[PDB]
């Protein structure tokens, strides 16, 4: 009888709540941070962008 529990090796886990848009704006605004952008060209582009100089920085001070 096949009963195992085998290891979830490299693996994210999973939101089981319903997902607030901030999920998505932490995302796109880190897209960029992430591939080593600096921060010139991230400001500028997100500015323009309809991102708000302080709505990127509480973005960026919540992934901390």
């Known amino acids: 009888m096949g009963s195992s529990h085998h290891?979830?090796?490299h693996?994210?886990?999973l939101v089981p709540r319903g997902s607030?848009?901030?999920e998505k704006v932490e995302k796109i605004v880190e897209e960029l941070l992430r591939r080593g952008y600096s921060?010139?060209?991230i400001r500028r582009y997100l500015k323009k962008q309809?991102?708000?100089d302080?709505?990127?920085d509480r973005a960026i001070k919540k992934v901390g």
């Open 7 to 9: 290891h979830h090796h």
């Open 11 to 13: 693996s994210s886990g």
């Open 20 to 22: 607030h848009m901030n």
């Open 39 to 41: 921060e010139e060209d």
């Open 50 to 52: 309809g991102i708000d």
């Open 54 to 56: 302080r709505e990127v």
